[PDB]
Amino acid sequence: MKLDIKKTFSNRSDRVKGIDFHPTEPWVLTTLYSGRVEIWNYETQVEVRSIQVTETPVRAGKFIARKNWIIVGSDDFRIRVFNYNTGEKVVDFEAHPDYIRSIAVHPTKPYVLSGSDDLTVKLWNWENNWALEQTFEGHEHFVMCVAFNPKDPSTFASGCLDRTVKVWSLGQSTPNFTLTTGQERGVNYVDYYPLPDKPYMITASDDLTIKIWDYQTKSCVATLEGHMSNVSFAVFHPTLPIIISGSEDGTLKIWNSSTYKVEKTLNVGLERSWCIATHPTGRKNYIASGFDNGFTVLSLG
């Protein structure tokens, strides 16, 4: 595939902190600093549903398509779940005594992870009345990002301002390992490469770097430099051999995942970039990113 980037749909809004694609409907969820969340059909450019969830920032939001839900987490410390077909608020609970930074949904089991400024990751089971099933303790600063290993989702990674990534096993109380990233301003984001040929993870930092890691040896494979302010995220695209990052410098960058050289820098004109999603099935090679002044959905080729 040749990079042939086309704007599918962009709209302005208050600052977009969380973003996610629905796997079967042509929908994107955005969660805003204002407490509002929006679901857009990016093919028809019509709003599916929107909710004023809270007056505090909503930093995290994901679809749970197999239950017809969205799950959101906000600076009022609460996790809320809504049925996107009816609008029903399914559950509303205090999850942590501090801000929620990140939510991840297990691909097959009824588990959600939340990472918080309270220094923990918590595991919630929606088949057990959203019970707290485990708290993962060990980090020493805000937990900014949680992600399951898609190839072994009995494990997951947490990225933390304490400058480490910890990889954990469900049901065990200490990390399988702690990765010292050398990203001395902390880790804002962690993501897994999805395919079985490389055991890779990627981290993004306020220190302006993105680092690729072999999680079997713990070695740094590569450091990607070029962003000029905090790097909010960096991810492997699920189908294309590229990495996509975004920054408070207002740019998205696309990097070759083999040579680690930048291939494209985009300034979509929405000021600082905060969040990313990739369409899981590679439908049209869609990506979406949220910014200070709205969001954009792009087809990469």
Binding site: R15, Y33, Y99, R101, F142, L161, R272
Partner: peptide, 6 residues
């Protein structure tokens, strides 16, 4: 102070 307040 809250770091990463924005």
């Amino acid at each position: 102070v809250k770091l990463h307040y924005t």
